[PDB]
Design a protein around this nucleic acid. Structure first.
Lengths: 98, 150, 79, 100, 113
RNA sequence: CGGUCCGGCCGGGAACUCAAAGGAGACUGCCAGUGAUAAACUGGAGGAAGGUGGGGAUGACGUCAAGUCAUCAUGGCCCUUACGACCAGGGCUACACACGUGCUACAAUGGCGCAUACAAAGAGAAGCGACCUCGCGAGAGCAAGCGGACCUCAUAAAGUGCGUCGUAGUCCGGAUUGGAGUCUGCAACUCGACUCCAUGAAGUCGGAAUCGCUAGUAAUCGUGGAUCAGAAUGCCACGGUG
């Protein structure tokens, strides 16, 4: 079994990467299920965003970390070798796990 | 100015079906807990039958049909100057104004049990003496010497 | 009952006493560290301590020994 | 902010590298409520009372583009008067203004 | 008040309203009776022949009253050395902790009018 | 729909949910009343629901020579053994003196213990630190789980139930204080935090006067985090009662 930790800061970049890795898996003959989306993880703050005092100028900002696992249940090796050196949309990170 | 507003008439009490008891527990509501007030008012008759309270048909009506408020005091401007003028009490606070005059008189009294301070305040309204009944009389006696403006 | 069973100390001022007892009528021995402890064998000596803008003289007594030097000297103005 | 405040802190972090780095739990072999009042671990204390220029204090994160100590946002290394510029100039991944 | 002097009237409560008097504190007065196997409720009537007088010596599990002011004085003459910081703050009309010079200061320096 | 360590614990699945995506949906268009059957409005029908729905968000000529060199670039004026800046002391909690603004009590719709129910959102790998131990305790050891929905911080509290104290300037409620301990740190004088015995002053819900809030708004109780060796009550967020 293998899982692939595909992570991004944008909700479309991870779908455009899913449309490359899951299509490569199906065209290489891998037996695969529908991949889980996972609960989104967030980072947020509200700060004084003016250059010098002006105390009314407090504003909110947020950023979101998206993760998918892909999850291969079958022990077949040749069907998934096409994923491990594959190029994906710029700004995503990949790590392989159990 | 503009408005013309929406208004609320509140839910009845879940034991007696009385909206007058509901407004009484809302004026008796402190710290937003609201269940606490149910355990203070109409939670005993044995404490009203300890003083002047005669039969259960008067165990709450002594704050309702026993009185009729009509006016409130303070000053009002007429032309270029201000005068002391009695103003006409509104017809739905008419039956719920004396609720504050009873709840305040019991709440600010130094005599321990609050459920008993309230039953004793209702007994002192059932005799028609002092608290709440003179707060009606004082402003009527004022308005019987102040009639030129409305 | 002081902070830890072992006291934090340096002997850098105690090492001057056997020479500060022969100064004559010269101006007293001068120090800047005020957290320093005063040992019983420092008694009967005049020392000059920082007040925050100058140095002022104090004499070591049976009330000053076993405590810190800064506890016996002024630290602020308007006096 | 004088430029020495960061230029000295980088030298103190390089010095903590022999005294505190993977050694901040090393007190856990000399700390005891009593120890039968014996002494056998002073070989650690001789080196924990040695440094003076390195300590668990005297540090200020500042901004990696300004020596200013306050108004800083740790995970970016930037300030509350620099991230709104960077997020509109397109200089930082993951962060944007408005839409959303 | 049989708790004090040669007096024998003792028909009082043993924890209720028995606070800050006769060397009694404010919380040990409750625990000493529970740890003796004694009920604290109702005015005392059935604890004759030393059964509660024996505990009134140790309620009071330290020095009390005129022998406590003696005990507090075993480190207070340090404040009369006058050269010392704590003594100088005690001869002056000043605080020694947790108070500032013009914000809420009159409650230790002295009142106005 | 099957097994039934009798437990979603597994086979398995996408069903209110939950986590995710895709497609529809709203236009004064439809119907009445009003009004140059013009423009346009208030309601009604449908529908989850409108009528600048609610929330984000852009800034036409003209304003305030608006704010900031204490956050930068760069010209001018000044310095350049100095206004450079590293050490041992230290300053910035001043002060014989005037005033705001905010918090919490005075109790008994209170205080306390036991029984009793529901969280929500956060944070955390030389981290958060469980079960277990010593001590009344601060806290110090033993030693799992967890990187996000099988963990830790962390029995949600106000509330619901029951007994009890009962104006005494009170076990309420609080300033000050003696002794003994717990902790990070060159360092705990001046100049740190926390715990427990011992002591416990005021405080009658506030007078002329003045200040703010219109519905999930006022009020009321609890959870969390950033800055953060150790140390704010301040601050940015998330829920309950109403």
């Amino acid at each position: 079994r293998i899982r692939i930790r595909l992570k991004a800061f944008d909700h479309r970049l991870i779908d455009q990467a899913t449309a490359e890795i899951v299509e490569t898996a199906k065209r290489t003959g891998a037996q695969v299920r529908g991949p889980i989306p996972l609960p989104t993880r967030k980072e947020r703050f509200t700060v004084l965003i003016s250059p010098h005092v002006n105390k009314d100028a407090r504003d909110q900002y947020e950023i979101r970390t998206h993760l998918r696992l892909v999850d291969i249940v079958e022990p077949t090796e040749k069907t998934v070798d096409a994923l491990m050196r594959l190029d994906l949309a710029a700004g995503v990170d990949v790590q392989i796990s159990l | 100015r503009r408005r013309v507003i929406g208004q609320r008439k509140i839910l009845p009490d879940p034991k007696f079906g009385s909206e007058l008891l509901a407004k009484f527990v809302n004026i008796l509501m402190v710290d937003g807990k609201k269940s606490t007030a149910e355990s203070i008012v109409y939670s005993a008759l044995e404490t009203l039958a300890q003083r002047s309270g005669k039969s259960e048909l008067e165990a709450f009506e002594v704050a309702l049909e026993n009185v009729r408020p009509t006016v409130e005091v303070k000053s009002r401007r007429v032309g270029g100057s201000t005068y002391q003028v009695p103003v006409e009490v509104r017809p739905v606070r008419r039956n719920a104004l004396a609720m504050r005059w009873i709840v305040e008189a019991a709440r600010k009294r130094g005599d321990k049990s609050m459920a008993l301070r309230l039953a004793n305040e209702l007994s002192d309204a059932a005799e028609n003496k002092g608290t709440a009944v003179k707060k009606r009389e004082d402003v009527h006696r004022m308005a019987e010497a102040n009639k030129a403006f409305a | 009952r002081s902070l830890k069973k072992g006291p934090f100390i340096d002997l850098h001022l105690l090492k001057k006493v056997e020479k500060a007892v022969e100064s004559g009528d010269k101006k007293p021995l001068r120090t800047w560290s005020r957290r320093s402890t005063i040992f019983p064998n420092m008694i009967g000596l005049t020392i000059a301590v920082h007040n925050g803008r100058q140095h002022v003289p104090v004499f070591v007594t049976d009330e000053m020994v076993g405590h810190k030097l800064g506890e016996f000297a002024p630290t602020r103005t308007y006096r | 902010a004088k430029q020495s405040m960061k230029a000295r802190e980088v030298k103190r972090v390089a010095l903590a590298d022999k005294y505190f780095a993977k050694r901040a739990e090393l007190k856990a072999i000399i700390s005891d409520v009593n120890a039968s009042d014996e002494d056998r671990w002073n070989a650690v204390l001789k080196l924990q009372t040695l440094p003076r220029d390195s300590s668990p204090s005297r540090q200020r994160n500042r901004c990696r583009q300004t020596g200013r100590p306050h108004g800083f946002l740790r995970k970016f290394g930037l300030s509350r008067i620099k991230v709104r510029e960077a997020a509109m100039r397109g200089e930082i991944p993951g962060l944007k203004k408005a839409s959303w | 008040a049989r708790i004090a002097g040669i007096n024998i009237p003792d028909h009082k409560h043993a924890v209720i309203a028995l606070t800050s008097i006769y060397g009694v504190g404010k919380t040990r007065s409750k625990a000493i009776l529970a740890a003796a196997g004694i009920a604290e409720d109702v005015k005392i009537s059935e604890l004759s022949e030393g059964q509660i007088d024996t505990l009134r010596d140790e309620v009071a599990k330290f020095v009390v009253e005129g022998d406590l002011r003696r005990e507090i004085s075993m480190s207070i003459k340090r404040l009369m050395d006058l050269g010392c910081y704590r003594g100088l703050r005690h001869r002056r009309g000043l605080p020694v902790r947790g108070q500032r010079t013009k914000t809420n200061a009159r409650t230790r320096k002295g009142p106005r009018k």
